[PDB]
Amino acid sequence: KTWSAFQNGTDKRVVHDSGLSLTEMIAVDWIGRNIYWTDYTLETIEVSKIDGSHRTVLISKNVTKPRGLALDPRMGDNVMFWSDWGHHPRIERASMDGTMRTVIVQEKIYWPCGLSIDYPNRLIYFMDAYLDYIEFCDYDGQNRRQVIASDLVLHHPHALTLFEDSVFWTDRGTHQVMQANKWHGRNQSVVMYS
Amino acid sequence: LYVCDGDKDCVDGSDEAGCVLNCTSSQFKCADGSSCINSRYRCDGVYDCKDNSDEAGCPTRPPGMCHPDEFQCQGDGTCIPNTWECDGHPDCIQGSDEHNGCVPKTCSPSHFLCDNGNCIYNSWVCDGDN
Amino acid sequence: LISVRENVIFGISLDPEVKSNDAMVPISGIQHGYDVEFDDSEQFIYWVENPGEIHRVKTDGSNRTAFAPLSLLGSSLGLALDWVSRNIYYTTPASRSIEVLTLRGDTRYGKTLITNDGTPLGVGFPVGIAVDPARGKLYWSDHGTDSGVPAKIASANMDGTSLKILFTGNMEHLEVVTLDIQEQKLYWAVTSRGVIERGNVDGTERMILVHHLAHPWGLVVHGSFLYYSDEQYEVIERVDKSSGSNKVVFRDNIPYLRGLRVYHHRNAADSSNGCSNNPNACQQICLPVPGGMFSCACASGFKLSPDGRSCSPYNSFIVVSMLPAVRGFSLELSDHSEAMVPVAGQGRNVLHADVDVANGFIYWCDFSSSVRSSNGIRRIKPNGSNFTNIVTYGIGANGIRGVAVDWVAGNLYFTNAFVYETLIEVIRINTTYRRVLLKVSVDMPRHIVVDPKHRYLFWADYGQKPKIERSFLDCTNRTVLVSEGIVTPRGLAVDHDTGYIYWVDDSLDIIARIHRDGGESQVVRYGSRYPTPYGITVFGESIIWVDRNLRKVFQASKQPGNTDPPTVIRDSINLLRDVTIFDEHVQPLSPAELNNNPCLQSNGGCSHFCFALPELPTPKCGCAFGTLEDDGKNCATSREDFLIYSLNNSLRSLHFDPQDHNLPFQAISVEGMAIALDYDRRNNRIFFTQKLNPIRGQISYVNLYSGASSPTILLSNIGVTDGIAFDWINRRIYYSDFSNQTINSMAEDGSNRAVIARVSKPRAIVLDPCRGYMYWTDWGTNAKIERATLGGNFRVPIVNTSLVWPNGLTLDLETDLLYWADASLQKIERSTLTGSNREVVISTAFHSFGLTVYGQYIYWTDFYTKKIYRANKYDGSDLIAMTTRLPTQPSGISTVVKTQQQQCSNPCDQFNGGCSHICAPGPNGAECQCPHEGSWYLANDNKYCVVDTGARCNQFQFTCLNGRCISQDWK
Amino acid sequence: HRYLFWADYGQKPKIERSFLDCTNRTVLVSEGIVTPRGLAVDHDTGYIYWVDDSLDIIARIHRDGGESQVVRYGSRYPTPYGITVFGESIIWVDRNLRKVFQASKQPGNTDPPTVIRDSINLLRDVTIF
Ligand SMILES: *[C@@H]1O[C@H](CO)[C@@H](O[C@@H]2O[C@H](CO)[C@@H](O)[C@H](O)[C@H]2NC(C)=O)[C@H](O)[C@H]1NC(C)=O
Ligand SMILES: *[C@@H]1O[C@H](CO)[C@@H](O)[C@H](O)[C@H]1NC(C)=O
Ligand SMILES: *[C@@H]1O[C@H](CO)[C@@H](O)[C@H](O)[C@H]1NC(C)=O
Ligand SMILES: *[C@@H]1O[C@H](CO)[C@@H](O)[C@H](O)[C@H]1NC(C)=O
Ligand SMILES: *[C@@H]1O[C@H](CO)[C@@H](O)[C@H](O)[C@H]1NC(C)=O
Ligand SMILES: *[C@@H]1O[C@H](CO)[C@@H](O)[C@H](O)[C@H]1NC(C)=O
């Protein structure tokens, strides 16, 4: 199941039933009052009303194995991004209503495990657990750079988040949460231990 | 809540250092004597105790979980391409990919071999990405 | 098209090139997916899980529910639906049965159509089911059993009255059967050979249609095409119904594949049958039969009448309990029909069942070590119309081990088992009134039974030296009926006619009876012929009992010495645990039958509880909370006593009655933050602890009775003090300091100060002056609770294990119990003054600053929720919040009780009143005595005694046991 | 009757019957035995009687097994430690009552017992000469 609560633990409620897969992502719209989530067993991307009252399946034709989902709901952008782990692992972008679809990164993805957006710069940040890297590109994939890449720092990443000039990620191989500088990684810190 | 849970939540573990080690009810026990931990964790896939012995007792998973093009990870219950199994890098969370004796895999001329014993396509050798 | 996978259900469009997978809103969260069925007239889809439960959801996602959770035993394996009669059919192997349920309206009706009957035609292990409504025919597939039932495809009538076998042989590991209504043909698949076969509904022909598969789940036929799925090939594909020679594939590389269905607007007018033609023609269930005719049937717990239109409920039946379910059997052993709607489903572990025949209820208790929700007491009606939870909060670690019901008083009695303690509690059946009547300590009462005619309550004990005990309905009296000859009393029963008690033992392998007044024990059906009698009941001139090893229910005559071979009621029942009877005769209600029980009429006028006491013509009343009043019937909550707490500056008062929103005293405001409070009965005054800034601690006192006098100050600047305690016998104040890691003592006016002990982070102090002890909490390294004398001269840790962050401590002098709170483990624990017994009172949603105990309740204040909470001090069986969300984070709490013992009633308790030997009860104050044998003599004062010759030494010394004197400085 | 009988005190206690050369083993009682402190045989009828201080029971069985029968059960017999059979009577000793008792061996009889000696300490077994 999927649950919604307040930042103080009160008013626990159920949005909708959810898939049993350990690889799942949820996205929310602070404008459209809609919620989007990924399904790894049915191989689908689904949209609903933030209160869960209405449900629909939005993309099903090529999303072999979703491992990441990110949204930009601003009036002038209205874009949705997700990552797939099929035999042709790629990062795909589509209008928030699925009426437009494009492939943004497909040349070196092998085990995508993170997807996050940086709204001021209009950048995408994604993580790969096979080549062990954190890399960012633009909404079209025509600008691309690598923040952190080494078998020493990244062992088994699973989630990525961004705040100011810092990037935060989680690693299952070291049971840790890490903070770094999102442009060059020349600053590294441990946010939570064990 | 955190000051006695078997998890060293800070650099020196000041929280856990003060706790007793007697294994109250439902607390599964570990040989290193580090901490006693709740039974529910026994087969969830996390090495909850220091000497890797909470899950060590657990049984194996249904083999039908992955396609023939894939290999399965016992601790995580996840599927990874067959080529990755014995490539020389631990891909599974608990290292289930490098198993027993691998008959070590080698690198062909269309690829390059580096310091860490990994094989990479020749075009990648010098393009700006490590 | 609809396809199932062990964790997902999804819909495919029926053309093979449309690869979209959202023809319907999917069904996520499935755990053990199995076959599915659909109803289009209400936009519903139903699915089964094995192991699991039967669930229905709507095609648009608007609703999701579990359809038959209380009657379903084990897991179902196949579903069939009838849209003409509006009936659903499902098959369950755990009960070797095929069952029918009615979808029409909000009121379910359910019966079992086919089960074991010794014949090979009967149902064995039914895995597959298909139905045809227009022709009134039902078809099922069954793996068979060791009863001679073959692996088969069988045909029956939807009313269950006819059985025939269509196909057999070459059938091992057969999973699904499906029917085609236009062809009148049946299709099934076999995994042992990898083939799909077709047959005729009359058994006239058998043929093979698909040749190479590996575990092919699912068959469905629509129009000219047949669809099947394969597990090992991970594929779902379609083939020509008429040829089997050409194939198309809809989806591939899909894992954990399961069976399939097709969704279309099938209509009842075309598929019409007798039930559709004659609506409302049956009172409960309507089942079609061949030739367009129909049949009527009653739900479980009901029987059918010669008119065929009506059903009548069973009013006299036997009730049997098994760990997985509760079932009823007719008194007529020729009737194998269910006498009550069974009780079965997830979490079932039934230990005991009891009945309230006059009100129409059955009450049972569930006990599981590994699952919290499974433990409890629940009541249901034999018709299944009502289900309720009676006791689900405040259950000990060892669960509830016994339930007894009293139909005269309208009371329920149960036993609750904690770690080192057991409790016997009574609850009024329809009101939030629950009380604890007895705390049993070393004895372990499990089985409990009550008799209102003789006004006695009986229970059995399972610990060391097991025994059977007799008590009164208020547990104010305890007596032992049997001590010798008991090892494992698995069951206890009482006879309401004769007033005799019977018990069964599987270690002794004996059934034995005793008389309510004790005395001579008597033996029934002893020997190896009774390997494991687990439950017994008494009815008329007979006793009925169940045996775990023989898997049987037996009836015999209760008089001892009889040896007629027993009588059998039901064979082959697994996990039998208890037997009970549901008949008006076992629960009389006439005053002449109940010996004029006072509670029989209007609860005897008692407000909370009514308890008939042997040989007392008037009722007796008990209060769940508060105290009892001189009218002998009502209860009050001592408005003379109140609770006092501080928010930051505002000292506020509260009443123990959560409905009495009046304030004991209006609110008072003080400088800074008031953190800790204590009150004294002598002055009607409060002593409080004040924090002025993060560095300055202060102590002040305020008066309630002295008009409206403002505060007075005792100490102006000390470290931040977080705890205060008062001693009214010695007129001393004790306080703790967090900034200085110290516990200090002072006098009522501050003119005298002393320091008692040092402990890191000394949050709380507790005092007992008549016994001379003080207790304190240390949450630093090696977190402990510690006890010392009022002067700190002796010191010992009361609790130093399984404790991490003790931040609250309180003591109750009525029970001599100590309670503490831990913020790391988020729980409240109670123990004795020695720490020899330990129990947990609250373990859920727990944050707390203060702790205080009054009456049957324990109270604490919570800074996270900004609320004050009240619970029951023995088990936490009740939880309520005394206040709305307060304006700011609460502080510590104290109680104002006017009935305090302002003087010690037993002066010898202060370390023998200071003596070494026998202390006299206050003749001229505390006074001392030596053994009357031997020439002993009283010394130091009139105090030490080991002086056998009256030998002399100088008074400036101190004179010891063993006859030696030493300078006082060495004392 | 050319039979040899013995009682077993380990896990799953039982009573067994054998031939004088122990070449045959058979079990007469398995259920209803916890602490068989004493075993006696009747040479007239060929019946076997045993006493138990855990069960607090005196019970008899037939040399060919089958139906178990009960004598003087209840709290009135706290610790019967030894039993012997003589004529129409059984004689047994009780460790807690410090007494020697005589009663009739037929089951179901409940005549109050008869006493032979009082105040005997540490009683363990009775035999007849
Ligand atoms: C407790 O409440 C139940 C449910 O309201 C009462 O049940 C009714 O009992 C009367 C007889 O006293 C029946 O005629 C009604 O059919 C019952 N109603 C239902 C809904 O079942 C019950 O009487 C109350 N008291 C006790 C002691 O159970
Ligand atoms: C989706 O699948 C179709 C058909 O297999 C293919 O032509 C198309 O390139 C795919 N699109 C993506 C983004 O993979
Ligand atoms: C980043 O790291 C450098 C050293 O590499 C250090 O001097 C600097 O203070 C760091 N900055 C922050 C904001 O942590
Ligand atoms: C340690 O735990 C055991 C039970 O596992 C208990 O018997 C023992 O008393 C405990 N020791 C202490 C010091 O509490
Ligand atoms: C189904 O869900 C709706 C949501 O509003 C609710 O009104 C209704 O009571 C539920 N149950 C039924 C049977 O429709
Ligand atoms: C359950 O009981 C209540 C009253 O106690 C009654 O109103 C309700 O109808 C009952 N439930 C059903 C399904 O009849």
Ligand SMILES: *[C@@H]1O[C@H](CO)[C@@H](O)[C@H](O)[C@H]1NC(C)=O
């Ligand atoms: C309670 O039991 C005692 C014996 O234990 C008995 O003397 C007394 O009469 C009983 N109480 C009443 C009210 O009869």
Ligand SMILES: *[C@@H]1O[C@H](CO)[C@@H](O)[C@H](O)[C@H]1NC(C)=O
């Ligand atoms: C009590 O708390 C409120 C906020 O909760 C604060 O504004 C007020 O100043 C506090 N009292 C004192 C005396 O500071």
Ligand SMILES: *[C@@H]1O[C@H](CO)[C@@H](O)[C@H](O)[C@H]1NC(C)=O
């Ligand atoms: C703490 O204790 C010391 C003596 O041990 C005393 O001098 C001091 O005044 C106390 N209070 C504070 C706030 O240090």
Ligand SMILES: *[C@@H]1O[C@H](CO)[C@@H](O)[C@H](O)[C@H]1NC(C)=O
């Ligand atoms: C705990 O208390 C016991 C006595 O109750 C004592 O023997 C033991 O040493 C204590 N252990 C600790 C760590 O304080």
Ligand SMILES: *[C@@H]1O[C@H](CO)[C@@H](O)[C@H](O)[C@H]1NC(C)=O
């Ligand atoms: C939690 O937040 C909700 C509003 O989001 C509020 O109603 C509630 O009082 C808050 N509770 C606490 C304990 O702060």
Ligand SMILES: *[C@@H]1O[C@H](CO)[C@@H](O)[C@H](O)[C@H]1NC(C)=O
């Ligand atoms: C020995 O016992 C067996 C049964 O255990 C019996 O069949 C056999 O007859 C006995 N021996 C003799 C010589 O009778």
Ligand SMILES: *[C@@H]1O[C@H](CO)[C@H](O)[C@H](O)[C@H]1NC(C)=O
């Ligand atoms: C492990 O368990 C699975 C089922 O969960 C199979 O039984 C498999 O054969 C087992 N054995 C090994 C070593 O994988």
Ligand SMILES: *[C@@H]1O[C@H](CO)[C@H](O)[C@H](O)[C@H]1NC(C)=O
């Ligand atoms: C390495 O493996 C490849 C196949 O992937 C070839 O077998 C090659 O011959 C191997 N090289 C060595 C040195 O054994």
Ligand SMILES: [Ca+2]
């Ligand atoms: Ca920790």
Ligand SMILES: [Ca+2]
């Ligand atoms: Ca684990």
Ligand SMILES: [Ca+2]
């Ligand atoms: Ca590898």
Ligand SMILES: [Ca+2]
């Ligand atoms: Ca490169």
Ligand SMILES: [Ca+2]
């Ligand atoms: Ca037995």
Ligand SMILES: [Ca+2]
């Ligand atoms: Ca005894």
